[PDB]
Amino acid sequence: MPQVADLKAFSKHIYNAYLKNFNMTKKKARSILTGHTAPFVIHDIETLWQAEKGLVWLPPYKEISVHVFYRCQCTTVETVRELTEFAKSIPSFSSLFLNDQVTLLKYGVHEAIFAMLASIVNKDGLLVANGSGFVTREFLRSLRKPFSDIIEPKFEFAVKFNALELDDSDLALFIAAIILCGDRPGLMNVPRVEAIQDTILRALEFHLQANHPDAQYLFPKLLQKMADLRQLVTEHAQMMQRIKKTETETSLHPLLQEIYKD
Amino acid sequence: LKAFSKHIYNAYLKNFNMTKKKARSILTGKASHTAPFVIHDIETLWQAEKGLVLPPYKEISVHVFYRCQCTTVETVRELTEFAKSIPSFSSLFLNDQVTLLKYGVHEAIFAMLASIVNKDGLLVANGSGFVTREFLRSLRKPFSDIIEPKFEFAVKFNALELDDSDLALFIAAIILCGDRPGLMNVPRVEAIQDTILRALEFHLQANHPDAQYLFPKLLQKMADLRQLVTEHAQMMQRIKKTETETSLHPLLQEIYKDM
Ligand SMILES: CCCCOc1ccc(C[C@H](CC)C(=O)O)cc1CNC(=O)c1ccc(C(F)(F)F)cc1F
Ligand SMILES: CCCCOc1ccc(C[C@H](CC)C(=O)O)cc1CNC(=O)c1ccc(C(F)(F)F)cc1F
Ligand SMILES: CCCCCCCO[C@@H]1O[C@H](CO)[C@@H](O)[C@H](O)[C@H]1O
Ligand SMILES: CCCCCCCO[C@@H]1O[C@H](CO)[C@@H](O)[C@H](O)[C@H]1O
């Protein structure tokens, strides 16, 4: 099959773009949470302040809850870069005019960020600083209200998502499909993207068949997860607008600013 | 430091197909290539279109207007590859790479036009033909109004006699201009811009020894270039506002918007 041909490869390429650009994979991550060092479990002020100073590891320290909030922003900023590189590592993506690539990453980065978060997280916590730390959900659950409410949803979806058992090759394609989404606000060359999206999804469709043989309704579930990811980022942007209103004191990083404006 | 000037010169040479080099030679009636077929009426332009040298052909003046667009579309394409070809530039987050390109391209397109023009006409289609300023003016006012201001600038700029090496450094100083509206990270840009300008200067003393007052002149041409585009946009908007029948490429739409 002429299609099945250029696709298995197109799949591999993206997978080779994922592996070259993300500092953390579910492969590496999953090992840490199961089978070197025992990541310093952060669960309170001491562990936090400890991990901070030098044990494990930025705006003027104001408070633990705001400090964590900031530590969640940096994460996003560093991820958006790897996601630009990953996007660029797709020849049909790079061809697009610079402005179209911005609109994609702008409205796409968080959908992709909430899917990759699931990789470095288990029902009890997430991996920080190249998996050398482990922030406990219980600690994160105890942060100040305004900021403690954005942390939970991310967890609820991460577990319901991680049950599909997707490895790094599925995610390579999954993330590409999230970035190249024609239905993006103010996109220009829409048909070109919609077209690039179909190749990715078809490649993703073939790939799930080989990689997850006797599996079930996996593909349609991921399209749903993609839809759930659209809604999660929405429920998120909303909480962020309230943080910029009520938390008159806490700051927002430049890149997170321009991402939310309109 | 020259590692910067060599880097930008090789970024400029590799990226833009028509350097002042090839172009300037092809106008000095030289021998290493071939004669350029002149275009002055509708018969020559059609011939060019035929073989010797895109929306539904509406009219004379509009067909040219369209050719102007598809020309700045491939210039913006080489200009993007160029800008990225400056490592210090690429580091920047995609969003700012665009803002610099959104307000810089036209300033940089008009400077390079002068590179391929002269009081009589300009080279079109890879120096394969030669459109005349005469034929250019003759087009209906809602089009001839944008073409001439560029010719006046063109000649009143080639009088400085730069060479590809300078331009490489001129176009870079225009692209990276932290005075662009909505730049997320102004300081990181104002820093790169300074390096290029300092780099430029050192290169102008060596490359244009006797050039009395060169470097300060260019910065002035830089300002004039913002002046030209600013006025160029005004007209374009006015056309988009009048010639409803006339289609404007989506990319030229995004650039102008808000200007
Ligand atoms: C895995 C589920 C956890 C939810 O994680 C989230 C949720 C929302 C966001 C939103 C960010 C900024 C608030 C964004 O909107 O871009 C970031 C993280 C990512 N946060 C971190 O990576 C993180 C990083 C450092 C710390 C620590 F150690 F400082 F406590 C705690 C953290 F949750
Ligand atoms: C060098 C001085 C000439 C002035 O050229 C100009 C002036 C303004 C613009 C503005 C363009 C679109 C209107 C833009 O704003 O991006 C483009 C050109 C570029 N035009 C062309 O490249 C061009 C291309 C083809 C033809 C023709 F006659 F052969 F069809 C005529 C042309 F001026
Ligand atoms: C790779 C990360 C990219 C993050 C991009 C964030 C883009 O924000 C948008 O940048 C545009 C210019 O490019 C502006 O015109 C929009 O008003 C602004 O909302
Ligand atoms: C390399 C050529 C780049 C041309 C870029 C033209 C960009 O236009 C701007 O694109 C932004 C999204 O990216 C929008 O948010 C702004 O409203 C719009 O004005």
Author numbering:
A (entry chain B): 205 to 239, 243 to 264, 271 to 475
B (entry chain A): 211 to 263, 271 to 476
Sentences from the paper on this structure:
Peroxisome proliferator-activated receptors (PPARs) belong to the nuclear hormone receptor family, which is defined as transcriptional factors that are activated by the binding of ligands to their ligand-binding domains (LBDs). The members of one subgroup, the peroxisome proliferator-activated receptors (PPARα, PPARγ and PPARβ/δ), are the key transcriptional regulators in fatty-acid and glucose metabolism. PPARs are activated by metabolites, such as fatty acids, and synthetic ligands and they regulate gene expression by binding to specific DNA response elements located in the enhancer regions of target genes.
The structures of the PPARδ LBD in complex with an α/δ-selective ligand, TIPP-401, and with a related δ-­specific ligand, TIPP-204, were also determined. The only difference between TIPP-401 and TIPP-204 is the length of the carbon chain on the central benzene ring. TIPP-401 has a methyl group, while TIPP-204 has an n-butoxy chain. In contrast to TIPP-703, the dual selectivity of TIPP-401 and the PPARδ-specific affinity of TIPP-204 are attributed to the chain lengths of the alkoxy groups at the centre of the ligand molecules. In the two PPARδ LBD structures, the protein–ligand interactions were essentially the same in the two protomers in the asymmetric unit. In the second binding cavity, the three amino acids of PPARδ, Val334, Leu339 and Ile364, are replaced by larger amino acids, Met325, Met330 and Met355, and thus a smaller second binding cavity exists in PPARα than in PPARδ. In contrast, the EC50 value of TIPP-204 with an n-butoxy group for PPARα was 250 nM, which is about 25 times higher than that of TIPP-401.
